[PDB]
Amino acid sequence: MNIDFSDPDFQYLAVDRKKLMKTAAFDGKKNCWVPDEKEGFASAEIQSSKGDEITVKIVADSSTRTVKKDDIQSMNPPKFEKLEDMANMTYLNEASVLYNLRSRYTSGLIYTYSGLFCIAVNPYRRLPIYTDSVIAKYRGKRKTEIPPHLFSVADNAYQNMVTDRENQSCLITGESGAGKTENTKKVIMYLAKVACAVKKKEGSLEDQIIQANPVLEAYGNAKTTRNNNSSRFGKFIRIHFGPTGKIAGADIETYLLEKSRVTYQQSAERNYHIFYQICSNAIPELNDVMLVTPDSGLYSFINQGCLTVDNIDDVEEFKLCDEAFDILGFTKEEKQSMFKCTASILHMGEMKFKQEQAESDGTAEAEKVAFLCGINAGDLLKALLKPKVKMVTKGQNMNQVVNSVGALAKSLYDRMFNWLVRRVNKTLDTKAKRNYYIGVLDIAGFEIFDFNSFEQLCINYTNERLQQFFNHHMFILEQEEYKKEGIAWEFIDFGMDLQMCIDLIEKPMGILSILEEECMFPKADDKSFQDKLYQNHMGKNRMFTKPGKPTRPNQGPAHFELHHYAGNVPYSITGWLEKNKDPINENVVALLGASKEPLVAELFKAQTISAVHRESLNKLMKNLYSTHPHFVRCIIPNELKQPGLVDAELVLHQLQCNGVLERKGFPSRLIYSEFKQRYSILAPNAIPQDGKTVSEKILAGLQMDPAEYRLGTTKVFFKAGVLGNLEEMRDERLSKIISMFQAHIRGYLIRKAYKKLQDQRIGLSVIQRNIRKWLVLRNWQWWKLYSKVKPLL
Amino acid sequence: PQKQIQEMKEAFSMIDVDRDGFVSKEDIKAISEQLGRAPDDKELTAMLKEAPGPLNFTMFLSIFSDKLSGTDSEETIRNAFAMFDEQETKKLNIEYIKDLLENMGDNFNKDEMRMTFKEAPVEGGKFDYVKFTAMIKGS
Amino acid sequence: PKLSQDEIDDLKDVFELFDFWDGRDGAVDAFKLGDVCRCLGINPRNEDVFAVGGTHKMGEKSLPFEEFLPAYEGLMDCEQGTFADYMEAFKTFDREGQGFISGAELRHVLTALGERLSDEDVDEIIKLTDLQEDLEGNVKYEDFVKKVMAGPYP
Numbered sequence A: 001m002n003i004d005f006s007d008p009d010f011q012y013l014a015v016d017r018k019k020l021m022k023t024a025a026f027d028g029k030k031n032c033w034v035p036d037e038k039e040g041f042a043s044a045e046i047q048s049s050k051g052d053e054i055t056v057k058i059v060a061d062s063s064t065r066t067v068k069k070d071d072i073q074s075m076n077p078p079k080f081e082k083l084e085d086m087a088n089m090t091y092l093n094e095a096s097v098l099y100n101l102r103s104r105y106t107s108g109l110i111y112t113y114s115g116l117f118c119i120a121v122n123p124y125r126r127l128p129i130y131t132d133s134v135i136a137k138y139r140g141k142r143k144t145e146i147p148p149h150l151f152s153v154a155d156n157a158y159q160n161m162v163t164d165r166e167n168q169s170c171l172i173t174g175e176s177g178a179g180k181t182e183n184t185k186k187v188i189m190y191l192a193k194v195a196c197a198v199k200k201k202e203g204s205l206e207d208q209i210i211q212a213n214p215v216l217e218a219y220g221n222a223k224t225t226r227n228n229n230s231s232r233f234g235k236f237i238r239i240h241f242g243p244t245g246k247i248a249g250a251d252i253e254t255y256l257l258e259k260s261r262v263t264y265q266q267s268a269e270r271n272y273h274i275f276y277q278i279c280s281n282a283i284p285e286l287n288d289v290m291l292v293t294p295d296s297g298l299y300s301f302i303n304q305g306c307l308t309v310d311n312i313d314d315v316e317e318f319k320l321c322d323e324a325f326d327i328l329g330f331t332k333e334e335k336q337s338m339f340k341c342t343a344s345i346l347h348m349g350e351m352k353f354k355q356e357q358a359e360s361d362g363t364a365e366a367e368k369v370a371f372l373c374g375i376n377a378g379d380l381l382k383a384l385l386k387p388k389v390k391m392v393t394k395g396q397n398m399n400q401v402v403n404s405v406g407a408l409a410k411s412l413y414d415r416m417f418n419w420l421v422r423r424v425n426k427t428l429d430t431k432a433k434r435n436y437y438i439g440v441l442d443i444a445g446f447e448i449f450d451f452n453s454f455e456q457l458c459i460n461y462t463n464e465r466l467q468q469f470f471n472h473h474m475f476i477l478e479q480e481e482y483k484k485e486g487i488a489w490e491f492i493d494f495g496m497d498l499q500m501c502i503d504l505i506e507k508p509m510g511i512l513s514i515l516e517e518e519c520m521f522p523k524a525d526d527k528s529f530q531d532k533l534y535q536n537h538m539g540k541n542r543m544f545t546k547p548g549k550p551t552r553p554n555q556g557p558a559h560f561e562l563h564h565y566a567g568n569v570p571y572s573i574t575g576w577l578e579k580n581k582d583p584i585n586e587n588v589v590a591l592l593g594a595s596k597e598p599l600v601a602e603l604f605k606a607q608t609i610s611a612v613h614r615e616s617l618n619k620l621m622k623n624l625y626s627t628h629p630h631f632v633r634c635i636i637p638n639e640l641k642q643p644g645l646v647d648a649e650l651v652l653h654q655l656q657c658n659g660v661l662e663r664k665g666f667p668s669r670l671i672y673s674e675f676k677q678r679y680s681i682l683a684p685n686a687i688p689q690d691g692k693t694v695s696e697k698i699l700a701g702l703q704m705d706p707a708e709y710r711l712g713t714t715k716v717f718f719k720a721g722v723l724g725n726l727e728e729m730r731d732e733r734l735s736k737i738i739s740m741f742q743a744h745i746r747g748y749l750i751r752k753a754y755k756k757l758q759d760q761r762i763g764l765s766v767i768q769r770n771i772r773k774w775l776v777l778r779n780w781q782w783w784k785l786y787s788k789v790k791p792l793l
Numbered sequence B: 001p002q003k004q005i006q007e008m009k010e011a012f013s014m015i016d017v018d019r020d021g022f023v024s025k026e027d028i029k030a031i032s033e034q035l036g037r038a039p040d041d042k043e044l045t046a047m048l049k050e051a052p053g054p055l056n057f058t059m060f061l062s063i064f065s066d067k068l069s070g071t072d073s074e075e076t077i078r079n080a081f082a083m084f085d086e087q088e089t090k091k092l093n094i095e096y097i098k099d100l101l102e103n104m105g106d107n108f109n110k111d112e113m114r115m116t117f118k119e120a121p122v123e124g125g126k127f128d129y130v131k132f133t134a135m136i137k138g139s
Numbered sequence C: 001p002k003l004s005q006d007e008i009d010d011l012k013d014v015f016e017l018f019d020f021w022d023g024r025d026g027a028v029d030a031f032k033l034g035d036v037c038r039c040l041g042i043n044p045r046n047e048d049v050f051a052v053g054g055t056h057k058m059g060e061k062s063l064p065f066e067e068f069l070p071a072y073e074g075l076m077d078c079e080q081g082t083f084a085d086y087m088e089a090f091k092t093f094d095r096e097g098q099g100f101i102s103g104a105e106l107r108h109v110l111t112a113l114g115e116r117l118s119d120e121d122v123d124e125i126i127k128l129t130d131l132q133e134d135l136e137g138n139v140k141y142e143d144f145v146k147k148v149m150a151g152p153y154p
């Protein structure tokens, strides 16, 4: 494995299992895990057994409790303590994967392997493990000759690219706040440091690659209840490498920016970080340039949830965002146009209105908007209260107007973020020669909330195509295990439902297309959309369902349920038409298209969310199917952002569907030993007296169809469902045998009483016979006369 | 039959009223009415017809000897009851013995049951079969 | 089955004894159909007997010999447990795999699983086989299975 001493560099990385191998006994037949409502699983020792009910002693406090024999999970022995790769343990079940991660975590060790997977537990504190000195120790190393660390995933993905001559991808997944974004940045940072090209104003490529984060996070991250720095957009970054193996260039794709946050925030949340940066007074000189008063709680568009965030200094981050634009090489103009447009949104939300048709309750605000956007205020105010289409003058009322301002803000912000991303890509697209790339992907995972809408459908749909990718690569790991066991599964059946759910969503009669066609009809509405979706899928597809009973209280309304890989999701289709198609006043558009400000002009220069997302998504999948993937599962340890604390039910839940061997239609497999010890009962009279042959005689016994299993050098494989059927026959068999034994016992007891039953038949015959004689004699005239005379002599 | 015989000889001479060595219809009709309860003039004929030949002490023992023939000894019968008394308590639960006699083997009809338990020695729900055996066998 | 003469004779003898016990009348109570077959060295399950006509209570249905023979030949077909079937089954309850099971567990299996036995029948069979537990209160199920399969007269 590896060599390393008392080096501080390894304080939070290495396990010195002999300063800690150094005082308690263990017995596999006695020590085990049992469910525990407050710690997930509790360490126990089996006291006794009474069928399916087992009595154990809870090692912590000596208490006693009863547990179904099936809920008991195998415990690993003391030797596998804090193991670095869990694929090496003996038992890889929820209970022991939970123990192994938790042990290492409370010890400050957040990185752990499990076969090809790297698990990262969110620290919730800064650690000293990302220093250049550490990066000096991980360079060029195999995962086995160095403790587990994100750097090794990156380095090995890099070593592969140069050795296998192929693109690589690091998919870093997890729940919100689990640590995806932090880890994605460490990966990029590592490559920028170990592979940078040979040798204020614009910095080099490497510097720009890193400085893209402060600007995109400023525009696409926001405090949410789960994460103070939550990504409200998905990201895919590709680092291209040239002939000498040094960084040639890079590009960035973003997906699904959360537009509604721009004008609406829930309790305890904030709008994008940029707005609080713009109001911090970090650079007093840009205040008059933005026409803003440095008081965030003053604007309606950002003062709905909270204003500040612990652990976040907006003043300081503004200075950082400001300087990041300098290094990315943005002119003073481009940069100020960015801050100017962002500031217009803050003013748009201030435009008051008065009581059929509506009117301005003033104009101070609109003059700010118009001034920053390079257009006349009166023109604006007009095109807002009474649009002139194609002219054709319309009459907007109070709401229609305050909804029109909200939509302008969102359409502006959105066009701006996409402009930002393309501008940053212009900087990163050095026209250098390149060969292969390493793409790091960080998007939100699947999610089921009390209320699910368009945004959730788009996120989930992206994950359904991703899961399929992950399933494709799992099948390859499947097919190579076969050969290693010397078998072959000619014909299989594993991914029809996944593709089926995907088709229901993206095909030309799918959920998204029905929406795209409907969004291009001025008269359509919610119900109109509800009818096409229903006529095309209700009762015509099993993945498309009618909402059942609430799975949780406070569960909002829904119109149909979609059976995703990770669970049934009830969706509501209210506002979906406005969500997919931008509802901005084409009149206010026209004015902006002719703005004095070059950025605004370009932003509105003469193709829906779902349409756009489909293309982005198709492109992403295409790039990924051309790479060798490296998966990182991030996991959030608790809901309090508290370092070192572990919330069992929370961590277990995150282990439920991600590859950590802790649902798939692949064949099941058993090590002959466990087989023989579990099913020798299915054919007891064909077992001589070699777990391998004992397993073949049982199967030979049941005479199972040879087309349902496969002989593994070390284990037997069954087609999905088979093992379930054997478990059933097992129940029937065990139950019947017990009955035959009970029948045998009843046969012993009755055969024991047989002799006495024959002796007594003779007894009873003598008694009945001789009483009848004594009776008939007593009625005999002669015996009666006689009885009368005996007393007289 | 050894000790019984002599007893059957004193009796025979008590039934034979006219003292002549032969029991006749009148001999019976007189001793019966004497000790009470005589048979019907037709019932007396039957008692004598059971002895095809003048009735002297020899024919007398003959009819009795052949009547009390076949039965089992007292020990045998006592041992037949013992087969249902495992505790060897020398008693049988009243319900149990009645159960055995009426519902099993050659079932006793309801009158045989009444005549059997009418003078049967029973106390505390226990049937004294050893006493009942001594009683059936003459003692 | 192709019962011989000797075997139909054995059947008639057992039937007769049993016809005597619920009152001699050429008939045998159907609730006793199972016990008749046990006397003849067969170990039928309750389900097996109800299926050939056995009843659930005395005083319901009676049977003449002619109807018995078939019921008998029928119970002769049903599966009889072997030694290896019993060991594997008990093996499923043996965690340490030493050949031991606690007296309580043994009683639990016989009284609560399969076609349950009563606590009196378990007490009776334990006494008759003279099965005794060590100081821990455990038994050697292999010896017990042997005692039961060997019969009252080993």
Ligand SMILES: Nc1ncnc2c1ncn2[C@@H]1O[C@H](COP(=O)(O)OP(=O)(O)O)[C@@H](O)[C@H]1O
Residues within 6 Å of the ligand: A122, A123, A124, A125, A126, A127, A174, A175, A176, A177, A178, A179, A180, A181, A182, A183, A227, A228, A229, A230, A231, A634
């Ligand atoms: N490796 C880490 N080191 C330090 N803090 C971390 C680390 N991983 C996560 N965090 C903390 O958790 C927060 C949430 O992480 P983040 O990467 O933003 O999650 P995600 O993108 O998965 O939603 C971060 O803002 C940070 O405070």
Ligand code: BEF
Residues within 6 Å of the ligand: A174, A175, A176, A177, A178, A180, A181, A226, A227, A229, A230, A231, A232, A444
């Ligand atoms: F909040 Be994280 F970016 F999913």
Ligand SMILES: [Ca+2]
Residues within 6 Å of the ligand: C018, C019, C020, C021, C022, C023, C024, C025, C026, C027, C028, C029
């Ligand atoms: Ca009868």
Ligand SMILES: [Mg+2]
Residues within 6 Å of the ligand: A180, A181, A229, A230, A231
């Ligand atoms: Mg994030």
Ligand SMILES: [Mg+2]
Residues within 6 Å of the ligand: B016, B017, B018, B019, B020, B021, B022, B023, B024, B027
């Ligand atoms: Mg006379």
